[PDB]
Structures are given as C-alpha cells and as structure tokens.
C-alpha cells in the first residue's frame, strides 16, 4: 500500500529540520546533530514489501545514511538496508552478502546497549544490517526488494520477530550535516 507513517526522531543535538511533505515525500536539513532518524514509510512492516523510493537530493556531509529502517517485536530487533551514505566505515561481525535490486550488499550484525528503541529510552537489542558494497546512484526510481534481504538474513540464522512495527525509507545520521529529499511509495 502507499505510505502511512512519519518517523521523526532525534536525541536533541543541533539542527534536524525534518519536513513532513505530501504523501510519501519528505525532506531533511540537518547540521551539527547527535543521532537522528527521519522518513516516510509504513506503520506495519512486511517481509514481502517492495519499497520504492526516489531520492531527489542526497547530500550527506559526515556520517549520514540513506537506508530502509524498521523493527519487529517478539523479539525486539532493528534492521537496516543501507543504499548510500556520506562518510562511514562499516565494521563489525560479518555474515555474507546478498544480491538485490541490481546491487550487492554486505550483511552485518551488531548490538545496541541501553539505547532508544520503539520499546523505550534505554533498551538493548540486536541489529541486522545489509550495507550496499558501493553507493547506489540516486535521483531515479529505486526499489528495495526487502524479501531478498529477509531471506538472506534467514539463511544465516538471523530471524526477525513475528510482530512487525514501522518500516521507513529513512535519512539517518550521527554528528553530521547534510540535506535529503526522498519520496517513498
Ligand atoms: K505532510
């Protein structure tokens, strides 16, 4: 279905001027921030959804990421499919690769401790990552066939929970500046 969810989260640092645009469109102007995640998407994620997006502007300056971001409960797990970024070194436990939507992604797993989640301000949870091996071109219609990622993660025993929460094509960052404009459908 078309989008029905607006995510606008910041830890409070600097400027995160997030604009809830028409329909699935949004934009973000950010500068000297802390952590933040912003985007349009769906209230209930699905492992079978094909996410469409067009990033008309993608201009991160620092640690910023253009990524599908979502959650399950039962158990509580955060997941990320990163298509582009500014300056970022991907590091940590490495599980393999998945090919999807004309690209190849590296699979990582991490843990966050005493951090914000959909369940509270100080929670501990596993994170599943797909990170594109090269930055995806932007400005044209793009697809994330999320089922390919779910299935690849499953093949490494990285199972998602049964109670699906939000699923957003996000702009996220950490102590950085930039601008983005993304339409999601
Ligand atoms: K709006």
Numbering used by the authors: 1 to 185
Quote the original article.
Fentanyl is a potent agonist of the μ-opioid receptor (MOR), with an affinity of approximately 1 nM and a potency 100-times that of morphine. Custom-designed ligand-binding proteins offer the possibility of both detecting and counteracting toxins such as fentanyl. Following the placement of the hydrated fentanyl into the binding pocket via PatchDock, RosettaDesign introduced 9 mutations to the Fen49 scaffold to optimize the protein–ligand interactions. Fen49 was designed to bind a solvated fentanyl.
From the SSM experiments, we identified a Fen49 Y88A point mutant, termed Fen49*, that proved to be more suitable for complex structure determination. The 1.79 Å Fen49*-apo structure again revealed a highly preorganized binding site, and an overall structure in close agreement with the Fen49 design (0.72 r.m.s.d. for Fen49* compared with the design model over 184 of 185 residues (TM_align score of 0.98)). The only significant deviation from the parent Fen49 is in the loop region Thr87 – Thr93, which contains the Y88A substitution. In addition, a 3-residue polar network between Arg89, Asp106 and Tyr108 on the backside of the binding cavity is disrupted in Fen49*. As a consequence of the altered loop, tryptophans 63 and 90 adopt non-designed rotamers and collapse inwards towards the center of the binding cavity, with the designed Trp90-fentanyl stacking interaction replaced by a Trp63-fentanyl dipole-quadrupole. Unlike the parent Fen49, Fen49*-apo produced crystals with an empty binding cavity that proved to be useful for soaking experiments. Fentanyl appears to stabilize the binding site; Fen49*-apo Trp63 and the Thr87 – Thr93 loop exhibit higher than average B-factors when compared both with the Fen49*-apo structure overall and with the corresponding residues in the Fen49* complex. Despite the divergent Thr87 – Thr93 loop, the parent Fen49 and Fen49* have virtually identical affinities for fentanyl, suggesting that this loop, and more specifically the differential Trp63-90 interaction with fentanyl, do not substantially lower the free energy of fentanyl binding. Instead, preorganization of the inner binding cavity residues appears to be the main determinant for binding.
